[PDB]
């Protein structure tokens, strides 16, 4: 009973196009395929814009005011979005491939590099109400005979430098009256001119060519005319200059070569400040901070993004996205971190809060198929088609043990004992479930009984039963633990592709090829419910299809499913464009999600394979925080969350209940009524107001007298609030008061508070414990320096 909304995309930080720093310099705008990602360097936080283009993005920029952002795709269709409010404002089609877009340093105009043509457009005013036709053109300039590489604005917003494939640099004047001031074409370069820049005084003009030549232009006598007084050359043996940017205030020249190395220079002296390599692939884009202290670089081939504090030679941001599609995903038990698995065979560990890769593991030779955590969360396990299962410690980030079959069996699925002492994997070629001992690394035994290939596995978190399904049209429950081994097979209507396990461990859900999610009772081995999926799924006819989508049967099943930790919902996905969220007890569709809207992707709408990327969801799971769920897809790890909570969902409300009345109760000091009233409205800001207004002396009183029905809600509220709040010890009193007063009740109903308790424990372990460690070590550091004898 919550509305999920797309929040951010992990696994990809740069794909192509130009990256622009925010005017404040604290945020970086990076294009990511069909969407735009925003990274807060100072706060170490990121988000991705919800709006989407028809095709892959081409060019972007942000105005100095930080309010208007324009995004243009490869077809020239532009989207104007309010940066502050994160909402689309206008859609305009420029009807031509726009190579580059840059706002004026006044902000009133923005220039568009369109073919061999320069377009200038007036900026709509965000303050005004929604206009139907806000774009009106100032002027059209047509001087170049081939495509324009890039353009640069004059600091006074009066002139524009444009560099094109003419081997020439041409200047313009924004004002018609000032045409005589700047109507000159610069020539001399022997290769394509990429970027022309002004000095801070604007007296000099610097031009750069692909061959690696920098020409400095001055207005001087021979009656006055432009001339190349000084010439500087980049002596790259074969590397060609790929992207160039300039910072007039600090006279910094940042150049990116196709060989994958960038050089920092000081003009006009041409002093090589530094020279580093990002790799062997071209540096596609380069940007400079408003101070000029941070440089951002981007390589498209590997999706490499880096922000360099060249002053201190430190790395503000340093991230590389998966080259392949993410085949699988797994959350940490606490939900702090998520691990993503790709067809390359490299694993990456990601932090949800920061949205950044802490480490990558490249021990697996082939594609990694599945990843899961133990109940403790200290260890993580992964399986790959290379024929190995590898156990990873995440506290120390090392592969402490590896498992493998006798004859190098390709594995596709894995499951781990909650006790963290047994690991089982399945294969598509043997029909046997191998079993390994985590402690020893020996093959305990091979479970046999499948008449088909094992498609999925899962150990019950509580009871420790193992449920395995196959294309065998049957499901088998294995009681491996204990003196005697028992197997209980259950038949299913069709082949089983995915399986989910209720956290209570009393039920198991399985997705079949027929498009059915069937729920069974493990103890009774009898079906308890079923859900239809065939009609809900949305599948788009591929461009190579010669038969209709409605008749198509390529994918109307779910290849992956997962429960909600509350246990009332299941999230499902498949090789389709749809993610469907269901309600198990009622067997109805809660809401459907469109994975992608990129027309380039195949499914959104004799020796050669007619083969292009397809939209698909490899894996899906709920966050243990019970506030978000992430879906692995070709574009990357999508995350949908309910954090906004802008919906009004009152609970047990009455006419007497009102925000003003709640405030009056606070003023009359009726904290319990004010606190209880707040949840009945279920407005976060009111609950925050009541939560922080309660005096510490009265916390034990209100906590004791809270009704039982509101206890799970308040417990959840504190957990999510405390993780990012500053009032550490205030929350600790609140948690202490609730647990001491209502501890016995939580024991009697563990599952009801399971998610709420976990969020509390996450706050206590991840941040609160870290503070005391920094507190206690200094306490002992104090005692040594004072107690023991000083040096001679």
């Amino acid at each position: 009973k919550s509305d999920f909304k797309f929040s951010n995309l992990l696994g990809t930080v740069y794909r192509q196009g130009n990256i622009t720093f925010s005017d404040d310099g604290k945020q970086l705008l990076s294009p990511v395929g069909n969407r735009v990602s925003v990274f807060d360097l100072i706060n170490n936080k990121s988000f991705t814009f919800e709006y989407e283009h028809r095709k892959n993005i081409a060019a972007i920029d942000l105005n100095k005011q930080g309010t208007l952002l324009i995004s243009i795709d490869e077809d020239g269709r532009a989207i104007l979005v309010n940066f502050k409010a994160r909402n689309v404002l206008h859609h305009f089609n420029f009807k031509e491939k726009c190579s580059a877009v840059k706002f004026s340093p006044d902000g009133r105009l923005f220039a568009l590099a369109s073919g061999r043509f320069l377009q200038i457009w007036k900026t709509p005013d965000v303050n005004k109400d929604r206009q139907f036709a806000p774009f009106v053109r100032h002027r059209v300039h047509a001087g170049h005979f081939q495509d324009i590489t890039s353009l640069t604005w004059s600091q006074d917003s009066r002139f524009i430098l444009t560099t094109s494939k003419d081997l020439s640099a041409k200047i313009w004047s924004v004002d018609s009256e000032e045409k005589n001031l700047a109507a000159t074409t610069f020539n001399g370069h022997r290769d394509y001119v990429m970027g022309a820049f002004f000095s801070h005084d604007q007296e000099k003009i610097y031009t750069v060519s692909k061959d690696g030549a920098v020409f400095v232009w001055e207005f001087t006598k021979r009656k006055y005319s432009w001339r190349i007084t000084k010439k500087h050359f980049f002596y790259a043996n074969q590397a060609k200059v790929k992207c160039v940017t300039f910072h007039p205030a600090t006279r910094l020249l940042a150049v990116g070569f196709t060989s994958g190395e960038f050089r920092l220079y000081d003009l006009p002296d041409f002093t090589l400040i530094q020279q580093l390599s990002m790799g062997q692939n071209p540096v596609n884009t380069v940007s400079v901070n408003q101070t000029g202290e941070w440089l951002a670089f981007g390589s498209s081939k590997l999706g490499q993004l880096l922000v360099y504090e060249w002053q201190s030679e430190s790395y503000i941001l340093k991230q590389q996205g998966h080259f392949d599609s993410t085949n699988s995903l797994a959350y940490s038990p606490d939900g702090s971190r998520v691990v993503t698995a790709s067809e390359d065979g490299k694993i990456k560990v990601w932090d949800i809060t920061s949205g950044f890769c802490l480490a990558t593991f490249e021990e697996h030779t082939s594609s990694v198929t599945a990843v899961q955590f133990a109940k403790r969360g200290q260890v993580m396990f992964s399986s790959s088609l290379d024929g190995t299962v590898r156990a990873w410690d995440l506290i120390r980030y090392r592969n402490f043990r590896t498992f493998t079959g006798t004859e190098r069996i390709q594995f596709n699925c894995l499951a781990v004992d909650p006790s963290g002492e047994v690991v089982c994997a399945g294969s598509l070629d043997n029909f046997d479930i191998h079993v390994w001992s985590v402690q020893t690394g020996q093959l305990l035994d091979a479970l046999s009984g499948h008449e088909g290939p094992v498609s999925c596995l899962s150990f019950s978190q509580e009871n420790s039963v193992l449920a395995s399904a196959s294309w065998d049209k049957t499901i088998r429950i294995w009681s491996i633990f204990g003196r005697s081994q028992q197997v209980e097979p259950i038949e299913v209507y069709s082949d089983v592709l995915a399986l989910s396990m209720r956290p209570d461990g009393k039920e198991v859900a399985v997705s079949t090829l027929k498009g059915q999610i069937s729920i069974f009772n493990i103890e009774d081995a009898k079906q308890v419910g079923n859900i239809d999926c065939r009609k809900d799924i949305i599948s788009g006819r591929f461009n190579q299809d010669r038969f209709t989508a409605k008749n198509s049967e390529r994918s109307k099943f779910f290849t992956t499913i997962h429960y909600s930790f509350d246990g009332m919902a299941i999230v499902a996905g498949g090789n389709n464009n749809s993610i469907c969220l269901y309600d198990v007890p009622n067997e109805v569709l809660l809401k459907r999600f469109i994975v992608s809207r990129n027309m380039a992707l195949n499914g959104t709408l004799l020796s050669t394979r007619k083969m292009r990327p397809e939209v698909r969801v490899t894996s899906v799971q709920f966050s243990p925080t019970a506030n978000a769920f992430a879906a692995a897809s070709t574009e990357g790890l999508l995350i949908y969350s309910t954090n906004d909570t802008i919906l009004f969902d009152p609970f047990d409300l009455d006419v007497d209940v009102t925000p003003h009345s709640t405030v009056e109760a606070l003023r009359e000091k009726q904290f319990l009524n004010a606190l209880v009233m707040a949840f009945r409205l279920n407005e976060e800001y009111l609950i925050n107001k009541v939560y922080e207004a309660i005096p510490i002396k009265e916390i034990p009183l209100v906590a004791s007298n809270i009704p039982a029905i509101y206890l799970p809600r308040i417990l959840k509220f504190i957990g999510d609030f405390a993780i990012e709040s500053q009032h550490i010890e205030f929350n600790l009193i609140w948690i202490k008061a609730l647990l001491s007063a209502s501890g016995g009740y939580i024991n009697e109903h563990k599952y009801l508070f399971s998610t709420a308790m976990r969020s509390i424990q996450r706050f206590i372990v991840r941040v609160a414990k870290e503070v005391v460690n920094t507190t206690t070590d200094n306490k002992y550091t104090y005692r040594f320096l004072v107690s023991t004898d000083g040096s001679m």
């Binding site: 005084d201 007296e203 207005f219």
Partner: peptide, 7 residues
């Protein structure tokens, strides 16, 4: 001074 100079 250049025609493109500030002011």
């Amino acid at each position: 001074v250049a025609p493109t100079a500030l002011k």
